Amino acid sequence: KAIPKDQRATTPYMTKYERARILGTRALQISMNAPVFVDLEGETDPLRIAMKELAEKKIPLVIRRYLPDGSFEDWSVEELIVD
Amino acid sequence: QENERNISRLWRAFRTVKEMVKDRGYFITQEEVELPLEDFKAKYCDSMGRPQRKMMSFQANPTEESISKFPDMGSLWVEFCDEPSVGVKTMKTFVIHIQEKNFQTGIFVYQNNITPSAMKLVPSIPPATIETFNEAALVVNITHHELVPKHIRLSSDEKRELLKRYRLKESQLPRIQRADPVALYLGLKRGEVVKIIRKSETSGRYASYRICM
Amino acid sequence: LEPGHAADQEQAKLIRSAIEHTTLKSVTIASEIYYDPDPRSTVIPEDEEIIQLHFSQQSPWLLRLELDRAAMNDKDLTMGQVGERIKQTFKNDLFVIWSEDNDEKLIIRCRVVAEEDHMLKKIENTMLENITLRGVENIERVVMMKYDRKVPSPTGEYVKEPEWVLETDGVNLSEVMTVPGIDPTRIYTNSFIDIMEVLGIEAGRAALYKEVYNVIASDGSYVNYRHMALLVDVMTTQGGLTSVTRHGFNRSNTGALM
Amino acid sequence: RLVKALEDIMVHYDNTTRNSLGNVIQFIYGEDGMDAAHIEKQSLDTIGGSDAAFEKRYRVDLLNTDHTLDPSLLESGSEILGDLKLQVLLDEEYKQLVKDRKFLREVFVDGEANWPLPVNIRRIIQNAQQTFHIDHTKPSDLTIKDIVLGVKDLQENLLVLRGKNEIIQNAQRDAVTLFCCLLRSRLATRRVLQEYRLTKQAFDWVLSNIEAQFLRSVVHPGEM
Questions:
Q1: Nearest neighbour of B205 by CB, restricted to D22, D166, D177
Q2: Is D135 exposed, middle or buried (0-12, 13-18, 19+ CB in 10 A)?
Q3: D-contacting residues of C 43-72, CB under 8 Å?
Q4: Cα distance from D216 to chain C (closest Cα, Å)?
Q5: Does D110 touch chain C (CB under 8 A)?
Q6: For residue C84, what is the domain's CATH number?
Q7: Distance (Å) from the C-alpha of residue C84 to the closest C-alpha of chain B?
């Protein structure tokens, strides 16, 4: 459990499944009037707002990546690289 | 003529065994594996034109670094029998001869079969170990075939490491069978892990691991 | 073939003969049983000219049988072996003389030491099929074909280069693997089950990949490697081939609901 | 039947390929960790050819004139001639290539040269050439050290696996073996100077792309 941050070994990039699930929930939350950490410059589509936050690294989530044994590393979307 | 055949055959089968043991780690001088045919009978066949298996037998010892890898490794006695079937009394001698001189393990070639009497005689004296080899099987060293990749035994230290780098239970590894020919050719025991290194068309070289169930 | 002996038809012919299975009943025309009572004199004219011819106890029932030349001269043979083969077959209770290879009627006759003409009849059956002149088992119709083979040149670039290659019907991998003159490394089989038994699982896996890739690519398609390797690996991670059927994988321990 | 047998294999977050129970099926996906959709047929340029041609294409010796390099390819070629610190490297490089040619002919026993691999390199050459308007007939600012170090350095970054112990560092050794062979053949100095004539500016762009693309070809953990 809980690999320590200095020992995280998995990829420093965002898998396309992480990117899709992040934008899902983030958009879902916004669509529930969750506060928004970016200036919606006219945008009104929750998915498009989410794509905006993510491009500004302003999504306050974090990815818990389970290893096959059961342990896990934690990356915060702000620190993962997007392509 | 027929004798000549069973010379060349017995010639080759010999060479295989010398390779097989050399791969198993023991010390075999390089150019002794390649002893040509004529000097073979000029060394091992009687002048009359027959093979004296009963003196072809020999012994060898763990190369100095195998101890550095597997220290518990000990010497090994290789032996051929001559009666095409093998009865207990012949084997009765072997199991004690291995015991008396007390090698780590002993390999028993033979020619035609083993009477199921001595077939039970085998699992007798630990920590020794007894392996039989119908010499038909040995005429070709199968590990030279193309499709067979280099297998490599893993010191129980390496094994303990690899299971940790991947976070594996032993049961989660690819398996091999102790009856598998290559497993036989190195004499694995349950729970031993060989590392297989094959050529890979997508990354050049690739290394896999099977545990000997 | 052996690495030096690449594209020497002759040397190939010898191997083809060396393994191709040959039973008697494939060379012989017909078998006759007589009652020519005297062991020495034979009512048949020619047999006399050879009875003394090798006389210089035995039953009165001549068993004589006749072989084709062109048959016996296709995978060509000498009755000198063929006889001693019979001689080595049963005993020396069955006296045998055979015609000379020069002789224009390829002839073998034999005799023995209730009524035997049934047991005599029995004998030819055995002789007909139970007796292998040469070859190994299960190996019939050893075609001999030519194949190019890209190999490097002494200038170091690759050049096509031909060689004889005995294809084969039927399979006996271990036996044939030792028959001298062949290259025992690069010998193949489309029955990957046997490769698995004789060369162990890892070769069995690589052969398996080979066979799948033939099926796919035979009709011109093309599948990326990793998809085939992944399958072939699933089939061989227990050691030994696991079929993709109810018996194979559905008998692992992978959760009943699956 | 096929789908139900391989139904649960998945690429895990360490690039193993395990089924539901967790048994390893392969230790990297497809033996190189690459995603199928990012593969392209390319040609290994060291496997083939007469060795004379192989000599001619890759050999570079400054101190002697059998395979010498004309200076007008690059700015500093004049004062290069007969150097020795560098004339070391070239061999060490050219040594490597000879090992590759030896190696590949073991992997591909029929000298087959076109094989599907990740990043397409030719196309990265062009885009550089056209983006920077490669003035042929004009010497280059590249210096042999930058080239040879450049390639040799780049390989350290093509990370399929990035654990830090010994076992992992050898898997990574292997996953990129064949790809590095390609990358070395394409980017040997003779090519870079004589053929592509990349500037200093072009090169690092070529290098920094090959890294960016390669890293994008790795399979994504979680992929069924």
A1: D177
A2: exposed
A3: none
A4: 18
A5: yes
A6: 3.30.1360.140
A7: 13
Residue A81: domain span:
1-83
Resolution in A: 3.0
Secondary structure of chain B in HEC code, one letter for each residue: CHHHHHHHHHHHHHHHHHHHHHHCCECCCHHHCCCCHHHHHCCCECCCCCECHHHHCEEECECHHHHHHCCCCCCEEEECCCCCCCCHHHHHHHHHHHHHHCCCEEEEEECCCCCHHHHHHCCCCCCCCEEEEECCHHHCCHHHCCCCCEEEECCHHHHHHHHHHCCCCHHHCCEECCCCHHHHHHCCCCCCEEEEEEEECCCEEEEEEEEEC
Q: Experimental method for this entry?
A: cryo-EM
DSSP code string of D102-133: HHHHHHSTT---EEEESS-SHHHHHHHHHHHT
Closest partner residue to D22 among A11, A16, A68, by Cβ?
A: A68
Domain count, chain A: 1
C253: contact with B, CB 8 A cutoff: no
Q: Give yes or no for a cis peptide into A60 (omega within 30° of 0).
A: no
Interface test with chain A among B163, B164, B165, B167, by most A beta carbons within 10 Å: B167
Give me the phi and psi of D204, to 5 degrees please.
-60, -25
Q: Where are the domains of chain B?
A: 1-140, 141-213
DSSP, res C11: H
